[PDB]
């Protein structure tokens, strides 16, 4: 059966018609730094999402 | 049907959908009648109808129904009360190998088994065609007041 070989979770409510999950990425870098420095690299964070029924 | 399926799709002489069905309970059998197969109305005695298996020159009336309490032998025996599906959607018996055109008027012959389509007036073929034993089962959309007995 498909309900035994694949995991079953319980989050959705009985009165829902759609849902959505998101995943996030990381963007950045680092450098070897000496004191009296003002040029520091910057990092960020982005993400996307998908739907279901 | 058959293997690769947990459940067999359908069995003859049983309703398929729960949509405006009518079952007559005041009937008596004259001969051995099997589930499925159309029946005639020979006569009416004190309210009840004496139904027989379809024969030549007789207008079909309904399809025999399967009850697991009335008939404990797999068929309807002589002198036994029976249920007849005058109106509704029931699985019948056929002697065909290919599903006819959709919404085509079926034709009956032999002992109430469907022989072919391309009729002029009568019941129609719903969407359904399954394999049973050695043969197939067709779904019939029974409508009351469909076959009118010809005047003499």
């Amino acid at each position: 059966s498909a309900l035994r070989v694949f995991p079953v979770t319980t989050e959705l409510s009985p009165t829902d018609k759609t849902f959505e999950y998101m995943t996030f990425d990381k963007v950045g870098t680092a450098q070897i730094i000496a004191d009296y420095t003002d040029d520091l690299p910057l990092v960020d964070a982005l993400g996307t999402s998908e739907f279901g029924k | 049907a058959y293997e690769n399926l947990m459940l067999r799709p359908a069995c003859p002489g049983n309703l398929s959908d729960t949509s405006t069905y009518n079952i007559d309970g005041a009937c008596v059998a004259q001969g051995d009648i099997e589930f499925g197969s159309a029946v005639q109305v020979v006569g009416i005695v004190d309210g009840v109808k004496v139904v027989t298996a379809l024969s030549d020159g007789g207008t079909p009336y309904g399809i025999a129904f399967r009850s697991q309490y009335e008939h404990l032998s797999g068929k309807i025996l002589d002198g036994e009360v029976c249920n007849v599906v005058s109106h509704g959607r029931v699985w019948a018996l056929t002697s065909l190998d290919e599903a006819p055109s959709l919404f085509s008027k079926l034709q009956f012959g032999s002992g109430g088994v469907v022989t072919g389509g391309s009729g002029y007036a009568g019941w129609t073929f719903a969407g359904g065609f399954v394999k049973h034993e050695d043969g197939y089962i067709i779904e019939v959309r029974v409508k009351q007041n469909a076959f009118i007995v010809p005047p003499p």
Partner: protein
Amino acid sequence: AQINASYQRDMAIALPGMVADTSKYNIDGACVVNEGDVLVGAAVQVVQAQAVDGHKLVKALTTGTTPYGVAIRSHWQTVNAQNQMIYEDGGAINVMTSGRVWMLSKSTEAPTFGSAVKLDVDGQEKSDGTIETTWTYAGGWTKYKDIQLVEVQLHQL
């Protein structure tokens, strides 16, 4: 001094694709929108009825096709779009195969009580349409704002 006032306003009688009567009706689920969108008050055609499973594929009426039933207005299954209510592709449709429903009409004159119903290629009622049905009129003939509506009696195919 002053004279008081009292006003009055009446509601409408119908809405496109809404069940008109409590008489014997038969609404068939287990139908799928094979392609395109289907309006609430328009007839549909059966592309294919699966044998083993039972689902019937439902599309919109085109030229030279037999109508099957009228879509039914629901607050849950339907999806709001185009400032209206429609059935989207890949979703279940409530098809009424028997009963009295309020249709969408393109005609301009009231019809007779008992007579055949003629649709056009779009699937909406037209007094001189081409596609022929077995359904008959019921008598109701009203209009919601700028939309014309007509009542029909549906017979099982």
